[PDB]
Tab-separated table of C-alpha atoms in Angstrom:
chain	number	residue	atom	x	y	z
A	19	UNK	CA	3.248	-22.969	3.003
A	20	UNK	CA	4.261	-20.792	5.999
A	21	UNK	CA	5.168	-17.103	5.307
A	22	UNK	CA	8.806	-16.181	5.791
A	23	UNK	CA	8.003	-12.584	6.697
A	24	UNK	CA	4.950	-11.292	8.548
A	25	UNK	CA	4.512	-7.590	9.289
A	26	UNK	CA	2.024	-6.279	11.849
A	27	UNK	CA	0.710	-2.779	12.488
A	28	UNK	CA	-0.297	-3.043	16.124
A	29	UNK	CA	-2.488	-0.675	18.085
A	30	UNK	CA	-5.665	-0.448	20.093
A	31	UNK	CA	-3.877	-0.640	23.444
A	32	UNK	CA	-5.534	2.531	24.659
A	33	UNK	CA	-8.966	1.694	23.272
A	34	UNK	CA	-8.802	-1.832	24.726
A	35	UNK	CA	-8.415	-0.512	28.270
A	36	UNK	CA	-11.032	2.209	27.747
A	37	UNK	CA	-13.566	-0.367	26.580
A	38	UNK	CA	-12.467	-2.757	29.327
A	39	UNK	CA	-12.636	0.062	31.893
A	40	UNK	CA	-9.060	-0.467	33.089
A	41	UNK	CA	-6.074	1.894	33.549
A	42	UNK	CA	-3.693	2.553	30.642
A	43	UNK	CA	-0.819	0.726	32.340
A	44	UNK	CA	-2.980	-2.420	32.271
A	45	UNK	CA	-3.352	-2.258	28.497
A	46	UNK	CA	0.360	-1.555	28.230
A	47	UNK	CA	1.043	-4.686	30.277
A	48	UNK	CA	-1.183	-6.937	28.172
A	49	UNK	CA	0.190	-5.393	25.020
A	50	UNK	CA	3.703	-6.459	25.970
A	51	UNK	CA	2.411	-9.891	26.917
A	52	UNK	CA	0.911	-10.222	23.445
A	53	UNK	CA	4.227	-9.310	21.805
A	54	UNK	CA	5.884	-12.042	23.855
A	55	UNK	CA	3.339	-14.757	22.988
A	56	UNK	CA	3.298	-13.876	19.307
A	57	UNK	CA	7.077	-13.816	19.149
A	58	UNK	CA	7.369	-17.328	20.635
A	59	UNK	CA	4.591	-18.756	18.487
A	60	UNK	CA	5.963	-17.306	15.248
A	61	UNK	CA	9.382	-18.694	16.089
A	62	UNK	CA	7.825	-22.119	16.666
A	63	UNK	CA	5.895	-21.900	13.400
A	64	UNK	CA	9.113	-21.361	11.503
A	65	UNK	CA	8.528	-17.734	10.567
A	66	UNK	CA	11.860	-16.074	9.773
A	67	UNK	CA	11.059	-12.371	10.110
A	68	UNK	CA	8.424	-10.607	12.178
A	69	UNK	CA	8.159	-6.848	11.801
A	70	UNK	CA	6.210	-4.920	14.425
A	71	UNK	CA	4.997	-1.340	14.146
A	72	UNK	CA	3.281	0.183	17.195
A	73	UNK	CA	0.831	2.690	15.716
A	86	UNK	CA	2.948	8.518	24.299
A	87	UNK	CA	2.648	5.011	25.804
A	88	UNK	CA	3.030	2.940	22.630
A	89	UNK	CA	6.223	4.970	22.230
A	90	UNK	CA	7.542	3.263	25.380
A	91	UNK	CA	6.310	-0.249	24.549
A	92	UNK	CA	9.330	-1.314	22.460
A	93	UNK	CA	11.984	-0.172	24.918
A	94	UNK	CA	9.989	-1.555	27.854
A	95	UNK	CA	9.488	-4.880	26.122
A	96	UNK	CA	13.177	-5.266	25.328
A	97	UNK	CA	14.426	-4.291	28.791
A	98	UNK	CA	11.947	-6.689	30.370
A	99	UNK	CA	12.143	-9.796	28.177
A	100	UNK	CA	15.590	-9.735	26.587
A	101	UNK	CA	16.824	-12.828	28.496
A	102	UNK	CA	13.897	-14.764	27.091
A	103	UNK	CA	14.707	-13.614	23.548
A	104	UNK	CA	18.349	-14.601	23.953
A	105	UNK	CA	17.283	-18.039	25.199
A	106	UNK	CA	14.893	-18.644	22.304
A	107	UNK	CA	17.426	-17.777	19.580
A	108	UNK	CA	15.649	-14.593	18.508
A	109	UNK	CA	17.636	-11.876	16.762
A	110	UNK	CA	16.582	-8.277	17.346
A	111	UNK	CA	16.727	-5.640	14.602
A	112	UNK	CA	15.108	-2.292	13.756
A	113	UNK	CA	14.113	-0.085	10.838
A	114	UNK	CA	13.771	3.678	11.044
A	115	UNK	CA	15.951	6.557	12.230
A	116	UNK	CA	17.003	5.030	15.537
A	117	UNK	CA	19.721	7.582	16.212
A	118	UNK	CA	16.949	10.146	16.773
A	119	UNK	CA	15.119	8.275	19.550
A	120	UNK	CA	15.003	9.279	23.246
A	121	UNK	CA	18.185	8.168	25.038
A	122	UNK	CA	16.651	5.541	27.355
A	123	UNK	CA	14.767	4.022	24.410
A	124	UNK	CA	17.824	4.089	22.161
A	125	UNK	CA	19.723	2.409	25.009
A	126	UNK	CA	17.393	-0.583	25.228
A	127	UNK	CA	17.445	-1.024	21.488
A	128	UNK	CA	21.235	-0.917	21.074
A	129	UNK	CA	21.659	-3.377	23.929
A	130	UNK	CA	19.120	-5.849	22.549
A	131	UNK	CA	20.686	-5.817	19.090
A	132	UNK	CA	24.177	-6.237	20.511
A	133	UNK	CA	23.212	-9.172	22.706
A	134	UNK	CA	21.225	-10.969	19.996
A	135	UNK	CA	23.405	-10.206	16.965
A	136	UNK	CA	24.608	-13.816	16.803
A	137	UNK	CA	21.262	-15.560	17.135
A	138	UNK	CA	20.119	-17.504	14.084
A	139	UNK	CA	16.430	-18.040	14.772
A	140	UNK	CA	13.539	-15.673	14.191
A	141	UNK	CA	14.522	-12.080	13.520
A	142	UNK	CA	12.253	-9.721	15.438
A	143	UNK	CA	12.204	-6.291	13.811
A	144	UNK	CA	10.828	-3.145	15.459
A	145	UNK	CA	9.955	-0.240	13.175
A	146	UNK	CA	10.933	2.794	15.261
A	147	UNK	CA	10.676	6.407	14.102
A	148	UNK	CA	9.908	4.854	10.715
A	149	UNK	CA	8.023	6.169	7.700
A	150	UNK	CA	7.567	4.631	4.259
A	151	UNK	CA	7.867	7.857	2.292
A	152	UNK	CA	10.839	9.175	4.246
A	153	UNK	CA	12.537	5.814	3.801
A	154	UNK	CA	12.083	6.147	0.038
A	155	UNK	CA	13.396	9.716	0.090
A	156	UNK	CA	16.493	8.565	1.957
A	157	UNK	CA	17.175	5.853	-0.586
A	158	UNK	CA	16.726	8.305	-3.425
A	159	UNK	CA	19.254	10.644	-1.819
A	160	UNK	CA	21.824	7.847	-1.535
A	161	UNK	CA	21.264	6.706	-5.103
A	162	UNK	CA	21.642	10.279	-6.316
A	163	UNK	CA	24.945	10.482	-4.451
A	164	UNK	CA	26.326	7.355	-6.107
A	165	UNK	CA	25.177	8.436	-9.562
A	166	UNK	CA	26.784	11.888	-9.368
A	167	UNK	CA	29.964	10.066	-8.254
A	168	UNK	CA	30.008	7.719	-11.236
A	169	UNK	CA	29.710	4.639	-9.042
A	170	UNK	CA	26.594	3.560	-10.979
A	171	UNK	CA	25.050	4.043	-14.410
A	172	UNK	CA	21.505	5.307	-14.990
A	173	UNK	CA	20.708	1.755	-16.093
A	174	UNK	CA	21.519	0.418	-12.638
A	175	UNK	CA	18.726	2.433	-11.070
A	176	UNK	CA	16.225	-0.419	-11.375
A	177	UNK	CA	13.629	-1.928	-9.047
A	178	UNK	CA	15.982	-4.870	-8.640
A	179	UNK	CA	18.662	-2.729	-6.992
A	180	UNK	CA	16.294	-0.349	-5.188
A	181	UNK	CA	15.764	-2.629	-2.202
A	182	UNK	CA	19.483	-2.332	-1.511
A	183	UNK	CA	19.020	1.279	-0.424
A	184	UNK	CA	16.082	0.648	1.927
A	185	UNK	CA	16.136	-0.193	5.647
A	186	UNK	CA	14.881	-3.650	4.747
A	187	UNK	CA	17.884	-4.285	2.518
A	188	UNK	CA	18.831	-7.549	4.214
A	189	UNK	CA	15.311	-8.978	4.315
A	190	UNK	CA	12.484	-10.280	2.066
A	191	UNK	CA	9.255	-8.453	1.370
A	192	UNK	CA	6.424	-9.484	3.734
A	193	UNK	CA	4.090	-12.035	2.175
A	194	UNK	CA	1.487	-11.081	4.737
A	195	UNK	CA	0.558	-7.760	6.321
A	196	UNK	CA	-1.746	-7.640	9.347
A	197	UNK	CA	-3.428	-4.689	11.047
A	198	UNK	CA	-5.452	-4.803	14.261
A	199	UNK	CA	-8.215	-2.619	15.743
A	200	UNK	CA	-10.249	-2.812	12.541
A	201	UNK	CA	-8.614	0.141	10.709
A	202	UNK	CA	-7.917	-0.410	7.015
A	203	UNK	CA	-5.016	1.846	6.106
A	204	UNK	CA	-1.326	1.269	5.475
A	205	UNK	CA	-0.401	4.337	7.504
A	206	UNK	CA	2.772	4.995	5.525
A	207	UNK	CA	4.246	1.635	6.576
A	208	UNK	CA	6.418	-0.516	4.273
A	209	UNK	CA	5.207	1.344	1.191
A	210	UNK	CA	7.566	-0.271	-1.335
A	211	UNK	CA	7.945	-3.595	0.456
A	212	UNK	CA	4.250	-4.450	0.729
A	213	UNK	CA	3.389	-3.660	-2.889
A	214	UNK	CA	2.240	-7.274	-3.465
A	215	UNK	CA	1.544	-8.361	0.121
A	216	UNK	CA	-1.689	-9.895	1.321
A	217	UNK	CA	-3.481	-7.538	3.715
A	218	UNK	CA	-5.457	-9.033	6.564
A	219	UNK	CA	-7.455	-6.671	8.735
A	220	UNK	CA	-8.988	-7.948	11.955
A	221	UNK	CA	-11.227	-6.046	14.360
A	222	UNK	CA	-9.584	-7.195	17.590
A	223	UNK	CA	-7.398	-4.784	19.533
A	224	UNK	CA	-3.750	-5.693	20.082
A	225	UNK	CA	-4.076	-6.982	23.679
A	226	UNK	CA	-6.644	-9.534	22.510
A	227	UNK	CA	-4.585	-10.733	19.558
A	228	UNK	CA	-3.287	-14.214	20.335
A	229	UNK	CA	-1.860	-17.388	18.818
A	230	UNK	CA	-5.248	-18.561	17.538
A	231	UNK	CA	-5.861	-15.125	16.052
A	232	UNK	CA	-2.540	-15.311	14.181
A	233	UNK	CA	-3.320	-18.759	12.793
A	234	UNK	CA	-6.548	-17.456	11.265
A	235	UNK	CA	-4.637	-14.758	9.425
A	236	UNK	CA	-2.169	-17.284	8.025
A	237	UNK	CA	-5.031	-19.644	7.190
A	238	UNK	CA	-6.581	-16.838	5.146
A	239	UNK	CA	-3.270	-16.091	3.430
A	240	UNK	CA	-2.835	-19.748	2.570
A	241	UNK	CA	-6.431	-20.339	1.521
A	242	UNK	CA	-6.255	-17.612	-1.124
B	14	UNK	CA	-24.774	8.324	3.005
B	15	UNK	CA	-23.965	12.034	3.500
B	16	UNK	CA	-23.847	13.776	0.118
B	17	UNK	CA	-22.272	16.840	1.789
B	18	UNK	CA	-18.517	17.568	2.119
B	19	UNK	CA	-18.194	13.862	2.875
B	20	UNK	CA	-17.785	12.872	-0.763
B	21	UNK	CA	-14.180	11.807	-1.581
B	22	UNK	CA	-12.426	13.966	-4.159
B	23	UNK	CA	-10.363	11.081	-5.532
B	24	UNK	CA	-11.461	7.438	-5.682
B	25	UNK	CA	-9.215	4.739	-7.191
B	26	UNK	CA	-10.460	1.293	-8.174
B	27	UNK	CA	-8.732	-1.933	-9.096
B	28	UNK	CA	-11.093	-3.662	-11.530
B	29	UNK	CA	-10.929	-7.401	-11.036
B	30	UNK	CA	-12.970	-10.531	-11.713
B	31	UNK	CA	-14.053	-10.151	-15.330
B	32	UNK	CA	-12.963	-13.667	-16.215
B	33	UNK	CA	-14.125	-15.445	-13.082
B	34	UNK	CA	-17.488	-13.703	-13.466
B	35	UNK	CA	-17.869	-15.204	-16.940
B	36	UNK	CA	-16.980	-18.789	-15.956
B	37	UNK	CA	-19.545	-18.774	-13.125
B	38	UNK	CA	-22.184	-17.426	-15.518
B	39	UNK	CA	-21.091	-20.230	-17.899
B	40	UNK	CA	-20.149	-17.733	-20.628
B	41	UNK	CA	-16.962	-17.106	-22.667
B	42	UNK	CA	-14.353	-14.828	-21.056
B	43	UNK	CA	-14.821	-12.131	-23.716
B	44	UNK	CA	-18.390	-11.541	-22.535
B	45	UNK	CA	-17.055	-10.705	-19.084
B	46	UNK	CA	-14.894	-8.004	-20.623
B	47	UNK	CA	-17.874	-6.256	-22.203
B	48	UNK	CA	-20.072	-6.482	-19.103
B	49	UNK	CA	-17.143	-4.981	-17.221
B	50	UNK	CA	-16.891	-2.233	-19.805
B	51	UNK	CA	-20.566	-1.511	-19.233
B	52	UNK	CA	-19.791	-1.315	-15.527
B	53	UNK	CA	-17.134	1.312	-16.284
B	54	UNK	CA	-19.713	3.472	-18.028
B	55	UNK	CA	-22.293	3.098	-15.250
B	56	UNK	CA	-19.802	4.081	-12.537
B	57	UNK	CA	-18.382	6.987	-14.521
B	58	UNK	CA	-21.883	8.456	-14.872
B	59	UNK	CA	-22.725	7.885	-11.219
B	60	UNK	CA	-19.422	9.171	-9.880
B	61	UNK	CA	-19.817	12.270	-12.043
B	62	UNK	CA	-23.253	12.893	-10.532
B	63	UNK	CA	-21.991	12.409	-6.966
B	64	UNK	CA	-19.460	15.203	-7.411
B	65	UNK	CA	-16.300	13.095	-7.316
B	66	UNK	CA	-13.460	15.016	-8.922
B	67	UNK	CA	-11.090	12.207	-9.846
B	68	UNK	CA	-11.659	8.564	-10.690
B	69	UNK	CA	-8.695	6.328	-11.445
B	70	UNK	CA	-9.356	2.895	-12.905
B	71	UNK	CA	-6.801	0.093	-13.041
B	72	UNK	CA	-7.573	-3.048	-15.039
B	73	UNK	CA	-6.236	-6.247	-13.477
B	86	UNK	CA	-3.068	-9.826	-30.022
B	87	UNK	CA	-6.605	-8.419	-30.167
B	88	UNK	CA	-6.373	-8.032	-26.389
B	89	UNK	CA	-4.028	-5.147	-27.172
B	90	UNK	CA	-6.823	-3.403	-29.108
B	91	UNK	CA	-9.563	-3.648	-26.448
B	92	UNK	CA	-8.673	-0.641	-24.248
B	93	UNK	CA	-8.322	1.692	-27.211
B	94	UNK	CA	-11.564	0.648	-28.873
B	95	UNK	CA	-13.524	0.983	-25.645
B	96	UNK	CA	-12.490	4.621	-25.473
B	97	UNK	CA	-13.403	5.295	-29.103
B	98	UNK	CA	-16.978	4.140	-28.505
B	99	UNK	CA	-17.335	5.832	-25.090
B	100	UNK	CA	-15.785	9.156	-26.116
B	101	UNK	CA	-18.933	10.771	-27.562
B	102	UNK	CA	-20.647	10.439	-24.198
B	103	UNK	CA	-17.598	11.549	-22.228
B	104	UNK	CA	-17.439	14.736	-24.281
B	105	UNK	CA	-21.028	15.789	-23.717
B	106	UNK	CA	-20.866	14.647	-20.087
B	107	UNK	CA	-18.076	17.192	-19.448
B	108	UNK	CA	-15.623	14.449	-18.416
B	109	UNK	CA	-11.897	15.079	-18.785
B	110	UNK	CA	-9.770	12.070	-19.733
B	111	UNK	CA	-6.275	11.567	-18.343
B	112	UNK	CA	-3.798	8.712	-18.020
B	113	UNK	CA	-0.988	7.483	-15.819
B	114	UNK	CA	1.532	4.987	-17.095
B	115	UNK	CA	3.933	4.688	-19.995
B	116	UNK	CA	1.397	5.326	-22.747
B	117	UNK	CA	4.362	6.000	-25.020
B	118	UNK	CA	5.017	2.254	-25.109
B	119	UNK	CA	1.451	1.260	-25.884
B	120	UNK	CA	0.448	-0.289	-29.247
B	121	UNK	CA	-0.132	2.275	-31.999
B	122	UNK	CA	-3.813	1.392	-32.139
B	123	UNK	CA	-4.458	2.109	-28.461
B	124	UNK	CA	-1.880	4.891	-28.203
B	125	UNK	CA	-3.867	6.765	-30.853
B	126	UNK	CA	-7.298	6.289	-29.261
B	127	UNK	CA	-5.875	7.492	-25.963
B	128	UNK	CA	-4.181	10.604	-27.336
B	129	UNK	CA	-7.394	11.480	-29.167
B	130	UNK	CA	-9.514	11.052	-26.038
B	131	UNK	CA	-7.333	13.430	-24.014
B	132	UNK	CA	-7.260	16.016	-26.799
B	133	UNK	CA	-11.016	16.070	-27.367
B	134	UNK	CA	-11.729	16.397	-23.628
B	135	UNK	CA	-8.874	18.605	-22.397
B	136	UNK	CA	-11.333	21.499	-22.009
B	137	UNK	CA	-13.942	19.638	-19.975
B	138	UNK	CA	-14.261	20.654	-16.336
B	139	UNK	CA	-16.280	17.915	-14.690
B	140	UNK	CA	-14.981	14.583	-13.426
B	141	UNK	CA	-11.431	13.681	-14.423
B	142	UNK	CA	-11.377	10.031	-15.465
B	143	UNK	CA	-7.872	8.537	-15.189
B	144	UNK	CA	-6.862	5.351	-16.982
B	145	UNK	CA	-3.908	3.481	-15.557
B	146	UNK	CA	-2.468	1.975	-18.720
B	147	UNK	CA	0.866	0.192	-18.750
B	148	UNK	CA	1.257	1.355	-15.177
B	149	UNK	CA	3.244	-0.078	-12.310
B	150	UNK	CA	3.736	1.400	-8.863
B	151	UNK	CA	7.358	0.355	-8.448
B	152	UNK	CA	8.180	1.266	-12.017
B	153	UNK	CA	6.638	4.690	-11.474
B	154	UNK	CA	8.884	5.340	-8.485
B	155	UNK	CA	11.965	4.132	-10.339
B	156	UNK	CA	11.262	6.534	-13.194
B	157	UNK	CA	11.042	9.409	-10.747
B	158	UNK	CA	14.356	8.410	-9.168
B	159	UNK	CA	16.152	8.440	-12.534
B	160	UNK	CA	14.739	11.884	-13.295
B	161	UNK	CA	15.912	13.178	-9.928
B	162	UNK	CA	19.304	11.467	-10.177
B	163	UNK	CA	19.771	13.136	-13.560
B	164	UNK	CA	18.658	16.499	-12.216
B	165	UNK	CA	21.149	16.153	-9.371
B	166	UNK	CA	24.084	15.155	-11.588
B	167	UNK	CA	23.354	18.105	-13.902
B	168	UNK	CA	23.585	20.313	-10.831
B	169	UNK	CA	20.092	21.771	-11.235
B	170	UNK	CA	18.930	20.734	-7.749
B	171	UNK	CA	20.513	20.364	-4.327
B	172	UNK	CA	20.464	17.236	-2.197
B	173	UNK	CA	18.173	18.965	0.321
B	174	UNK	CA	15.613	19.670	-2.406
B	175	UNK	CA	14.933	15.931	-2.578
B	176	UNK	CA	12.041	15.893	-0.106
B	177	UNK	CA	8.628	14.252	0.185
B	178	UNK	CA	7.288	17.655	-0.765
B	179	UNK	CA	8.950	17.789	-4.171
B	180	UNK	CA	8.694	14.066	-4.900
B	181	UNK	CA	5.118	14.272	-6.208
B	182	UNK	CA	6.370	16.536	-9.019
B	183	UNK	CA	8.168	13.592	-10.614
B	184	UNK	CA	5.295	11.099	-10.432
B	185	UNK	CA	2.557	10.574	-13.036
B	186	UNK	CA	0.066	11.972	-10.513
B	187	UNK	CA	1.864	15.288	-10.063
B	188	UNK	CA	-1.247	17.416	-10.632
B	189	UNK	CA	-3.511	15.133	-8.631
B	190	UNK	CA	-4.566	14.690	-4.990
B	191	UNK	CA	-3.750	11.338	-3.422
B	192	UNK	CA	-6.862	9.141	-3.321
B	193	UNK	CA	-8.806	9.058	-0.056
B	194	UNK	CA	-10.354	5.773	-0.981
B	195	UNK	CA	-9.031	2.753	-2.824
B	196	UNK	CA	-11.364	-0.050	-3.811
B	197	UNK	CA	-10.601	-3.554	-4.968
B	198	UNK	CA	-13.103	-6.082	-6.251
B	199	UNK	CA	-13.201	-9.902	-6.380
B	200	UNK	CA	-12.711	-10.019	-2.623
B	201	UNK	CA	-8.970	-10.263	-3.137
B	202	UNK	CA	-7.381	-8.506	-0.154
B	203	UNK	CA	-4.084	-7.418	-1.669
B	204	UNK	CA	-2.527	-4.314	-3.175
B	205	UNK	CA	-1.118	-4.993	-6.614
B	206	UNK	CA	1.745	-2.560	-7.126
B	207	UNK	CA	-0.694	0.328	-7.637
B	208	UNK	CA	-0.234	3.931	-6.464
B	209	UNK	CA	2.389	2.779	-4.000
B	210	UNK	CA	3.425	6.279	-2.911
B	211	UNK	CA	-0.006	7.818	-3.415
B	212	UNK	CA	-1.900	5.344	-1.228
B	213	UNK	CA	0.168	5.677	1.946
B	214	UNK	CA	-2.791	7.016	3.943
B	215	UNK	CA	-5.707	5.939	1.752
B	216	UNK	CA	-8.584	3.938	3.160
B	217	UNK	CA	-8.906	0.445	1.717
B	218	UNK	CA	-12.203	-1.207	0.924
B	219	UNK	CA	-12.097	-4.750	-0.421
B	220	UNK	CA	-15.506	-5.763	-1.712
B	221	UNK	CA	-16.422	-9.349	-2.562
B	222	UNK	CA	-18.403	-8.987	-5.815
B	223	UNK	CA	-16.823	-9.219	-9.273
B	224	UNK	CA	-16.329	-6.065	-11.317
B	225	UNK	CA	-19.182	-6.918	-13.725
B	226	UNK	CA	-21.638	-7.099	-10.802
B	227	UNK	CA	-20.293	-3.910	-9.200
B	228	UNK	CA	-22.817	-1.066	-9.413
B	229	UNK	CA	-23.962	2.313	-8.103
B	230	UNK	CA	-25.135	0.767	-4.856
B	231	UNK	CA	-21.754	-0.896	-4.365
B	232	UNK	CA	-20.012	2.411	-4.898
B	233	UNK	CA	-22.418	4.166	-2.530
B	234	UNK	CA	-21.762	1.436	0.023
B	235	UNK	CA	-17.993	1.893	-0.187
B	236	UNK	CA	-18.361	5.638	0.287
B	237	UNK	CA	-20.659	5.079	3.280
B	238	UNK	CA	-17.997	2.848	4.791
B	239	UNK	CA	-15.317	5.418	3.956
B	240	UNK	CA	-17.319	7.994	5.890
B	241	UNK	CA	-16.785	5.613	8.848
B	242	UNK	CA	-20.489	4.903	8.360
């Protein structure tokens, strides 16, 4: 019935403000508010994993969201995780991330995942490198290099493939996001910019997924 | 629709809805297959005229003989139309009947220089990537390549589409908004166009429409 894993490529924060004739900081503010509302709603719906990918300012959104609403996440049993090369992020951003993961590592509710400094192809390349290492070492046989064991070398090793993939602001591209993981996912593209995405908007996407 | 440098070099299509098209038209499923085959010929001609350089088609025990026989009957026209036939997938594991038709089609068109028509037969996105990993793992164990040589740059060399540009446009019919384990690595930045009509009803206008949309109108 309800998807266990929903992934969202979010953007349109800049365009939203431009069209609305408001400063960037205003779109940034609403953007964070949307992340908060969607996180609570998904948790209530019973969703288990929610992966967010913010496609300058959007670069600050994750860190800013975590530093500002962590107490709320802790309260609502949300566990924070990430995918991507986090050790290469700006210090103050890396700080917020590490702190959020540490303080939510024991929560058992919805796992909120932020894709930071992430890329589908590079993720694949990294896995290949690891697999090559193990093979040359004799740890595995050439027969063990199957699509069943491949997920074990990806960032999403401890999580299921998204049943549903959503992208805002119209745009109909994958943008090098979750290449291997979304190979069978349902793609739902909506025209609304991120700041306008709400609970109702999310239900429609799920409705579509279900009714198909 | 701007015919200029706005025409995609590589268009990939996931052919769907041959069966559903037949049931609606209250006809046997086999008739949907043939109407869909006719659609393949129409589009190949049209695409060739538009200037498209690559066209990859992905279909989505007589059934095992259908792909091979379609080629045998279409080959004469492909030859004179200057179309070059290619394939992606493990054709080596295809039935002798179809394996033969395929190998003959590539041989008799290898010198053509117009549109390159690619048939995804016995193809799987994940499986393709796994095959490339094994090749690379073997090359690494043998000591022929260094760990640093395993980059996104060199990865295309181990895929079936090594000598091909990633598609700029990917189309799927039957209004089913979902990627089906097809050109996983190659479609990272491709534009997706999900059209509602069934493959048998898909035509030149539909293709033109998709391209118009690709051109961001």
